[PDB]
Write a protein that holds these residues in place. Structure first.
Motif, PDB file in Angstrom:
ATOM      1  N   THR A   1       6.736   0.865  66.382  1.00  0.00           N
ATOM      2  CA  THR A   1       6.904   1.990  65.469  1.00  0.00           C
ATOM      3  C   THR A   1       7.102   1.454  64.030  1.00  0.00           C
ATOM      4  OG1 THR A   1       7.959   3.341  67.191  1.00  0.00           O
ATOM      5  CG2 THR A   1       8.409   3.953  64.893  1.00  0.00           C
ATOM      6  N   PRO A   2       6.254   1.872  63.070  1.00  0.00           N
ATOM      7  CA  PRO A   2       6.255   1.499  61.644  1.00  0.00           C
ATOM      8  C   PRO A   2       7.553   1.739  60.900  1.00  0.00           C
ATOM      9  CG  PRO A   2       4.127   2.301  62.216  1.00  0.00           C
ATOM     10  CD  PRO A   2       5.028   2.624  63.393  1.00  0.00           C
ATOM     11  N   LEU A   3       7.911   0.768  60.068  1.00  0.00           N
ATOM     12  CA  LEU A   3       9.157   0.843  59.355  1.00  0.00           C
ATOM     13  C   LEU A   3       9.399   2.160  58.610  1.00  0.00           C
ATOM     14  CD1 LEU A   3      11.793  -0.506  58.584  1.00  0.00           C
ATOM     15  CD2 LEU A   3      10.551  -1.686  56.815  1.00  0.00           C
ATOM     16  N   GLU A   4       8.332   2.707  58.019  1.00  0.00           N
ATOM     17  CA  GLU A   4       8.429   3.959  57.252  1.00  0.00           C
ATOM     18  C   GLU A   4       8.940   5.061  58.138  1.00  0.00           C
ATOM     19  OE1 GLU A   4       6.496   1.432  57.461  1.00  0.00           O
ATOM     20  OE2 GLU A   4       4.481   2.151  56.910  1.00  0.00           O
ATOM     21  N   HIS A   5       8.254   5.225  59.270  1.00  0.00           N
ATOM     22  CA  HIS A   5       8.620   6.235  60.236  1.00  0.00           C
ATOM     23  C   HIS A   5      10.080   6.101  60.630  1.00  0.00           C
ATOM     24  CE1 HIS A   5       7.513   8.850  63.860  1.00  0.00           C
ATOM     25  NE2 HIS A   5       8.802   8.587  63.982  1.00  0.00           N
ATOM     26  N   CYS A   6      10.492   4.867  60.945  1.00  0.00           N
ATOM     27  CA  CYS A   6      11.859   4.598  61.396  1.00  0.00           C
ATOM     28  C   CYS A   6      12.840   5.015  60.357  1.00  0.00           C
ATOM     29  CB  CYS A   6      12.081   3.112  61.668  1.00  0.00           C
ATOM     30  SG  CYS A   6      10.923   2.333  62.777  1.00  0.00           S
ATOM     31  N   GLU A   7      12.542   4.586  59.138  1.00  0.00           N
ATOM     32  CA  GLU A   7      13.428   4.845  58.024  1.00  0.00           C
ATOM     33  C   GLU A   7      13.537   6.324  57.690  1.00  0.00           C
ATOM     34  OE1 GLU A   7      14.616   2.899  53.738  1.00  0.00           O
ATOM     35  OE2 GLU A   7      12.619   2.431  54.588  1.00  0.00           O
ATOM     36  N   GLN A   8      12.384   6.987  57.690  1.00  0.00           N
ATOM     37  CA  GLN A   8      12.316   8.401  57.401  1.00  0.00           C
ATOM     38  C   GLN A   8      12.983   9.302  58.409  1.00  0.00           C
ATOM     39  OE1 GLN A   8       8.225   9.477  56.163  1.00  0.00           O
ATOM     40  NE2 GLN A   8       8.304   7.416  55.198  1.00  0.00           N
ATOM     41  N   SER A   9      13.185   8.822  59.630  1.00  0.00           N
ATOM     42  CA  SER A   9      13.818   9.669  60.620  1.00  0.00           C
ATOM     43  C   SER A   9      15.252   9.307  60.926  1.00  0.00           C
ATOM     44  CB  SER A   9      12.965   9.732  61.897  1.00  0.00           C
ATOM     45  OG  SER A   9      12.519   8.466  62.329  1.00  0.00           O
ATOM     46  N   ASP A  10      15.781   8.329  60.195  1.00  0.00           N
ATOM     47  CA  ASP A  10      17.150   7.905  60.423  1.00  0.00           C
ATOM     48  C   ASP A  10      18.177   9.007  60.076  1.00  0.00           C
ATOM     49  OD1 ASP A  10      19.577   6.427  60.672  1.00  0.00           O
ATOM     50  OD2 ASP A  10      19.358   5.763  58.554  1.00  0.00           O
ATOM     51  N   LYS A  11      18.758   9.652  61.082  1.00  0.00           N
ATOM     52  CA  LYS A  11      19.746  10.717  60.874  1.00  0.00           C
ATOM     53  C   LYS A  11      21.147  10.168  60.651  1.00  0.00           C
ATOM     54  CE  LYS A  11      17.593  13.457  64.666  1.00  0.00           C
ATOM     55  NZ  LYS A  11      16.241  13.299  64.105  1.00  0.00           N
ATOM     56  N   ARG A  12      21.331   8.842  60.704  1.00  0.00           N
ATOM     57  CA  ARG A  12      22.669   8.232  60.530  1.00  0.00           C
ATOM     58  C   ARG A  12      22.839   7.634  59.133  1.00  0.00           C
ATOM     59  NH1 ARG A  12      24.496   6.357  65.740  1.00  0.00           N
ATOM     60  NH2 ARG A  12      22.929   6.650  67.399  1.00  0.00           N
TER      61      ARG A  12
END
Lengths: 95, 95
Positions: free
Chosen positions: B26-37
């Protein structure tokens, strides 16, 4: 029966009225061209044998309106309509 | 993050049984953009030093047994892909 007529289609199993068909046409097909163009041409072919011994003489074309879904008493939980199967693939989360 | 550690892991487990590396690509952007914490957030405003992807590196796996992407596939089918691998190798047979 003639064009524009509305016939009821009945279930020989339980006598239920299933659908109402609205006749477009009533044509007499060339059973030989069907035999040959659709199911190869061999007279021993099952479809062809049916075509000649069971299929009557005329084809009655027409759109259908639905009155009742067929009743089945075997394996109802394993039978699915396109709609039900789709909902199921969903429930299962399949893609 | 480091291939060295991973290969270490693979060598140790292999002494006892099979090891499977699944790279959740999973691409860093996606990961970062969905971080709810808001953890990638605090990393971005420097409250967290050396956070993988922001500061520290992530050595991409070169020869993993399976590569998946939570951006393009769902948890359910990623799981299904892993399960199929275990099955092809005989792990899910009956005992």
């Amino acid at each position: 029966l003639q064009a524009g007529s509305r016939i009821t289609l009945r279930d020989f199993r339980d006598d239920r009225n299933l659908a109402i068909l609205t006749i477009d046409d009533i044509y007499r097909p060339d059973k030989t061209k069907e035999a040959k163009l659709v199911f190869g041409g061999d007279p021993e072919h099952p479809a062809i044998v049916y075509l000649n011994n069971t299929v009557k003489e005329f084809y009655i074309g027409g759109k259908i309106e639905a009155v009742n879904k067929l009743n089945h008493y075997d394996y109802v939980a394993l039978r699915y309509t396109p709609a039900e199967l789709r909902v199921h693939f969903d429930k299962l989360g399949w893609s | 993050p480091y291939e060295e550690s991973r290969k270490f892991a693979r060598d140790a487990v292999s002494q006892a049984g099979s090891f499977f590396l699944v790279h959740v690509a999973t691409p860093l952007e996606h990961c970062e953009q969905s971080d709810k914490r808001g953890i990638y957030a605090a990393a971005r405003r420097g409250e967290i030093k050396g956070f993988t992807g922001v500061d520290d590196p992530y050595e991409t796996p070169e020869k993993a047994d399976l590569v998946v992407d939570f951006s393009k596939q769902s948890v359910r089918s990623i799981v299904h892909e892993i399960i199929l691998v275990l099955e092809s190798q005989g792990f899910l047979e009956r005992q």
